[PDB]
Design a protein around this ligand. Sequence first.
Ligand SMILES: CC(=O)N[C@@H]1[C@@H](O[C@@H]2O[C@H](CO)[C@H](O)[C@H](O)[C@H]2O[C@@H]2O[C@@H](C)[C@@H](O)[C@@H](O)[C@@H]2O)[C@H](O)[C@@H](CO)O[C@H]1O
Ligand SMILES: O=c1ccn([C@@H]2O[C@H](COP(=O)(O)OP(=O)(O)O)[C@@H](O)[C@H]2O)c(=O)[nH]1
Ligand SMILES: [Cl-]
Ligand SMILES: [Hg+2]
Ligand SMILES: [Hg+2]
Ligand SMILES: [Hg+2]
Ligand SMILES: [Hg+2]
Ligand SMILES: [Hg+2]
Ligand SMILES: [Hg+2]
Ligand SMILES: [Mn+2]
Length: 263
Amino acid sequence: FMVSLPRMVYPQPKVLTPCRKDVLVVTPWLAPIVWEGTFNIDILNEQFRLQNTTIGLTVFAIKKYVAFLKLFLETAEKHFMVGHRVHYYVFTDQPAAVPRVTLGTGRQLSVLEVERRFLSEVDYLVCVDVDMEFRDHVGVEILTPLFGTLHPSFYGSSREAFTYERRPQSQAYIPKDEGDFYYMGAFFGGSVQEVQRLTRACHQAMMVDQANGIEAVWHDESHLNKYLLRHKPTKVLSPEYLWDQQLLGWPAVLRKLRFTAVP
Ligand SMILES: CC(=O)N[C@@H]1[C@@H](O[C@@H]2O[C@H](CO)[C@H](O)[C@H](O)[C@H]2O[C@@H]2O[C@@H](C)[C@@H](O)[C@@H](O)[C@@H]2O)[C@H](O)[C@@H](CO)O[C@H]1O
Ligand SMILES: O=c1ccn([C@@H]2O[C@H](COP(=O)(O)OP(=O)(O)O)[C@@H](O)[C@H]2O)c(=O)[nH]1
Ligand SMILES: [Cl-]
Ligand SMILES: [Hg+2]
Ligand SMILES: [Hg+2]
Ligand SMILES: [Hg+2]
Ligand SMILES: [Hg+2]
Ligand SMILES: [Hg+2]
Ligand SMILES: [Hg+2]
Ligand SMILES: [Mn+2]
């Protein structure tokens, strides 16, 4: 049951005036592709707050990568789902090495040393790489049953150029005449149910390959791409959500750089 939205005053959307004329904002299966200018965050914030949405953010920090946690968490505090309930889950082999970061109200952090827990604790799960930092808003506009993010290096490439696993012997195999986009394994998510379905599928697919003595060219990412090809994401995030300015600069097509790689 969704309660009614309150009166709100904002610019009227114009039917005969496209959001962006420089990019595709909807996939062929009618899933929005999230770019700055396509969403009114005030409307979306209202919609998700009225549902008291809790977002879980999961990151793995093993070995030397624990050194990336401080900047990651501090910037997440300034840009990730601000205003909403957030639960960080840090999986690490060095619990005592997790930095003491100050969190805003309604936000929590759990350290798990290396999940039915997720189902009862959060509504959505966002899975990202830790060697990153948030530079701009990353909010509820990304929430949906299942989403993938366009890899910053292939958003303008043709499918035959996509670095999918091309060996038929692999469960992640995708022929050159197939493929919608090349999603990066560093940022995906959705409802807890859909994310667990995805991870379960990939885990099983990888075990099969291992048994057959083969390892997908880009490991987890290869399987993620196979999964999202066969199970279309309900939203696709633009490269604004996964960029590397040192390697790729700042094209005009990107009005904001929200989540970026840390050298
Ligand atoms: C710079 C880098 O080491 N490699 C660049 C490629 O980026 C990698 O792409 C593969 C899939 O083809 C994987 O997704 C891999 O994780 C990517 O590297 C990671 O992400 C990039 C954006 C960088 O941040 C890198 O440091 C990081 O390890 C890229 O696809 C190609 C084409 O642009 O260039 C390579 O230099
Ligand atoms: O020694 C490692 C290597 C990787 N990772 C985790 O695995 C993710 C992906 O690895 P990496 O970022 O090195 O891949 P890349 O972005 O270079 O393709 C990292 O962000 C961490 O979350 C880790 O915890 N310890
Ligand atoms: Cl992840
Ligand atoms: Hg628009
Ligand atoms: Hg996850
Ligand atoms: Hg994760
Ligand atoms: Hg998979
Ligand atoms: Hg996997
Ligand atoms: Hg996967
Ligand atoms: Mn990374």
